[PDB]
Amino acid sequence: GMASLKAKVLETFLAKSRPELLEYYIKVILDYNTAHNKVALSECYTVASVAEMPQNYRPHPQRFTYCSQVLGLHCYKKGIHYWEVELQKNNFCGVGICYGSMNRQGPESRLGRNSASWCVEWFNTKISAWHNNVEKTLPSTKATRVGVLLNCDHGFVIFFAVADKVHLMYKFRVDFTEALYPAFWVFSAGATLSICSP
């Protein structure tokens, strides 16, 4: 019964317009203590890019040591939330969510490559959705912006491509077991991920 009701709510959210999604807006700020040495933060901690000069980070237990990732400041276990990320030179980069308990060290700390995270990703300019180290290739888009709809109350996440209107990239139904952080990956030179304020 819950699964049948969840499905009807999911269809409603898949059909929402951008103004309707923006009603769930949440302000995401990047967490300085999580950024890998190769990740530079700028514009009042709303932009992540690949560092071209030393960032002079101190080692921190919450800092990613293996891959070029960074988290948002806050995590969410209740409510329904929406944020957007503008991309430049998106040859190798990723946008997703993860449990706080995701490992921050070693190969398994990569977004979508473990059971604690979900993401969409550009990889040699080709798009895929990832969870639990299982890939789903997706059609290309000319959009330069991703919208993430995180629904903790009903249990799903949706990734939208945002241009003049919104288009589905991929979704996951999940009965989440703990709070979720926005999460980001920037790997190719010149790649930038900018959190939007519309």
Residue numbers in the entry: 432 to 629
What does the paper say about this structure?
Tripartite motif (TRIM) family proteins are RING-type E3 ligases that play key regulatory roles in innate immune signalling pathways that lead to the induction of a type I interferon (IFN) response and production of inflammatory cytokines through activation of the IRF3 and NF-κB transcription factors. To understand NS1-mediated inhibition of TRIM25 activity on a molecular level we have determined crystal structures of the CC domain of TRIM25 in complex with NS1-FL and the isolated ED, and of a TRIM25 CC-PRYSPRY fragment, which includes the RIG-I-recognition domain of TRIM25.
These experiments show that the interaction between the two domains is weak in solution but involves the interface observed in the crystal structure as mutation of Y463S and Y476S weakened the interaction even further. The functional importance of this interface for the correct positioning of the PRYSPRY to enable substrate ubiquitination is highlighted by the almost complete loss of RIG-I-2CARD ubiquitination upon mutation of these residues although the overall fold of the PRYSPRY domain remains intact. Taken together, these experiments suggest that in the absence of other components of the system, the PRYSPRY domain is in a dynamic equilibrium between a bound state and a constrained diffusing state tethered to the CC by the flexible linker, in agreement with recent results, but that the bound state is important to enable substrate ubiquitination.
